Amino acid sequence: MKRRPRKWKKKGRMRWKWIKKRIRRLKRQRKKERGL
Amino acid sequence: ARMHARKRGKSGSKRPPRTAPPIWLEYTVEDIENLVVKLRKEGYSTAMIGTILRDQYGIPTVKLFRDPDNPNRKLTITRILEKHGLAPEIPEDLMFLIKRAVNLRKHLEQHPKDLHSMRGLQLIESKIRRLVKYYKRKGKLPKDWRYDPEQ
Amino acid sequence: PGKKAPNGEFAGRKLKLKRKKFRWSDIRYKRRVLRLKEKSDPLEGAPQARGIVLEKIAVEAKQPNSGMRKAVRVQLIKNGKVVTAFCPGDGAIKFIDEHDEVIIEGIGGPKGGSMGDIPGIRYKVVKVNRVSLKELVKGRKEKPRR
RNA sequence: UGGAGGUGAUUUAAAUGCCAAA
RNA sequence: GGCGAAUACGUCCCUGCUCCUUGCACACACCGCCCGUCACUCCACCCGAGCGGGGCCUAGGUGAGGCCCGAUCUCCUUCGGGAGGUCGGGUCGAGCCUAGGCUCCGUGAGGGGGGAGAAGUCGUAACAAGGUAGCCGUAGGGGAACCUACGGCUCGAUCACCUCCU
RNA sequence: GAGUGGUGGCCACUAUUAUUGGGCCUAAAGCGGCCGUAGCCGGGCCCGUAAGUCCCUGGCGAAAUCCCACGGCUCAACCGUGGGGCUCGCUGGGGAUACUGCGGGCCUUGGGACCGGGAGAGGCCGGGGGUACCCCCGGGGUAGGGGUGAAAUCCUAUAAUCCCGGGGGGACCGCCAGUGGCGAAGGCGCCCGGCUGGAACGGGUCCGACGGUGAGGGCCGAAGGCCAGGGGAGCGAACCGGAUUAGAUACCCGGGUAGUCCUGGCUGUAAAGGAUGCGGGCUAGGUGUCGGGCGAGCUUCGAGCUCGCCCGGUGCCGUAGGGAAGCCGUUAAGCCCGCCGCCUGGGGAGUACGGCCGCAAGGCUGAAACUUAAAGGAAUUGGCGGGGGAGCACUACAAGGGGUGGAGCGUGCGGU
RNA sequence: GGUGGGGUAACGGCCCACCAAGCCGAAGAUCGGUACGGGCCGUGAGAGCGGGAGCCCGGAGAUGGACACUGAGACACGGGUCC
Ligand SMILES: [Mg+2]
């Protein structure tokens, strides 16, 4: 992914690391359904 | 700065501004040419001949005498050697770089994991290619001449 | 960052290329050249439109304001799309009946969009059955056909 | 006087903000 | 008014208040601020079985009509020929049919996150050393914010010691 | 003011598209690092040419439209006669040579080559070691050891913890050690030997502009992960138990698989940060430290010590100047000459669709509908902290004396 | 692109027969999108940015797609033929 160091600031949002993990989990499911 | 390392060394020679040879110098032009030919026949490099002439015979650079045959230019060691047919076929710095590259390649055959030394080889070959382009432009090398390490 | 480049006398092509390249980062230029507004505009570039009323609704104001704003759903004659139009005035909703025809135009907010404390509404009613709504609100005129 | 680094440690548990301001 | 003691001559441990210094995403001033899942309402969008309808390329077949060259026929000739019908040959050709491949529009069972709203719910992850310092990369685990391991940064508080400077 | 308001579009506002004329340490923005092809930018002198460039002059670029004076409709708008401009573009000739281009000649300052005495955890290969830790065997001794805020799981009469004599194994190199050294960056620390890369200083040595940057392209690249074959001491994702808690999928405790280590490949990612791209010239001083050279003085004569100056690295304080400020300040974030990369309010979103690469995990490239009035930075005054320091109080404690909370009743309050 | 012809008012791969492997392209070919071109017009201190219906000059069309007769000139808006 591309870097947005502004997203790492914690004021008014959750941690960027776990958002990235959640997005990567979401993208796996779409890829699996595409192969079917 | 340096071509690759980007350092700023300043060491070098500081030649005073002068035109005529000094009074205390007693050698004539012919003696100097004979000395140069003798030293070349002993097997020295062009840069080494001038060093010996300066250190031992008390002769500052031979670029203080006009060329007796061509009055429009001054004398240099390479021109003196050309006047007798002892000049190198390949320019000396190119030959030295090629010689350094050949020795390093056979080291890297027994040490394939020496990655830091390999970058030195790449830089050396970059210098070689710059020089060969320049010498092709001026006509000092044949147009078909090519550098191949496998040779 | 060094000096701005290129500055050479014979470097016109690169300079023109650079200026063209970075002009696409301007959002106003991009929307005009690619014609993005015309692709999604329900009014199809017109300043006004005519439609038929389907039903009456009310929308709550945003915080920290309080109140209900009276609006209508309008189906456009020219393409059949359905939009929402605000009815300006005090008690103006009483002059609107279902199945009437109305003329609507932009509401006049920033960037050609919504305004005030009612986002989501982009249009307002101007005429009802070919009679000015402002007159009806003030008086001076009666709504035709009862 | 004022600064910049390094190594150590740092004794239980302790969540929340309604009413009102309107 | 009568009668008339015990203990301490201290400390900031508990409850609090004053001043110096330091951190702060707080100023309604920590009774502050603030995050995510599940439930409810509305809006735009994505994937998508099926279902219809259009447009382009190809390949094959067919082909109104046009032109040219032959043979023959009918009627007029100022005898030079002209006007046309029928058959044969060659060539060009709009359109039409079949098959294949790309592409557009309308519906669409089912699935997915996004944005507003205001509170139905469970917790308290971030801001002070936020009560386990916070954050980046990679990997595993968990109702949900999150937790753990290896390498990194200071955009980390307090005490003791050490080191290097002005 | 016979007009005056609403809606949509273009220019200006806007130096929010910047040639004139913007930005990129902390606010959006310098590729993780380097090598190099095209392009762009390129040191000094002499001779020639005349393509670029400048001057003069012929042939052209319709009219209408624009500007000026005069003239006709009452003046004007409008129209006519003259003078300019516009279509900035083309073409035939003549003249000049400062700059750029092209051809020839001559240089040494930038860059490269070579020689000398030295410096350094730069890299690869072989050998030899240092304590420490774990397991096994033998001797002594006997009831606990371990661990926490407090405990428990766990180990121990098959003799543990602790002490002594032996055998085996895998990883790692303490103090000295230093805003010290080396490397393009990632990174590099036991000792002896071999091979090898780069840099600084000293230089009347050699070549003679051979240079800077670099779209496409190439090579290197912490940890983790994957594919085959080994190894496995200690530590330790997942997992299994003991606790804490309202719950505790955690923090704390006892165990433990992958992994961490070696050989051959793949992946190409970090707060890969000096959050600061690289080359050149110039613009006060002061003071430490590392390498080389020079001078002077000491000396146990040491590759030793002290002081001064030059060059190159590495820190601190600071003048002019710069900046929103924090601050930077010859190691610039100052003034000037170059080249490439990137940014254009906050979200949606580094997402959807398409393409390339990879065994996989994943990498590079990258929108729109819609939504929103701020998001973001530096600094100020207060209030607060399960931050530090100093002080104080029987509506605080500590040392004491007497009580209230249980019963009946007096009186006040909520509720009914 | 060459050689030899045909056809045209006329030069030409405009069209044929034969001989070669050429031509264009990261200084953007090919393909896709959107548009008649210019003199001019709107705005701005200028450098620029945006438009090009109405008047003049040039191009193209006559419901869509093809094709001919007459003539100096047409494949003809108020002439002809087919789908
Ligand atoms: Mg506030």
Ligand SMILES: [Mg+2]
């Ligand atoms: Mg709270």
Ligand SMILES: [Mg+2]
């Ligand atoms: Mg917390």
Ligand SMILES: [Mg+2]
């Ligand atoms: Mg915490």
Ligand SMILES: [Mg+2]
């Ligand atoms: Mg876990």
Ligand SMILES: [Mg+2]
């Ligand atoms: Mg504006």
Ligand SMILES: [Mg+2]
């Ligand atoms: Mg700006």
Ligand SMILES: [Mg+2]
């Ligand atoms: Mg930023």
Ligand SMILES: [Mg+2]
């Ligand atoms: Mg960088």
Ligand SMILES: [Mg+2]
């Ligand atoms: Mg960076």
Ligand SMILES: [Mg+2]
């Ligand atoms: Mg020059």
Ligand SMILES: [Mg+2]
């Ligand atoms: Mg000229």
Ligand SMILES: [Mg+2]
């Ligand atoms: Mg004119």
Ligand SMILES: [Mg+2]
């Ligand atoms: Mg008059």
Ligand SMILES: [Mg+2]
């Ligand atoms: Mg007049």
Ligand SMILES: [Mg+2]
């Ligand atoms: Mg006139």
Ligand SMILES: [Mg+2]
């Ligand atoms: Mg024993």
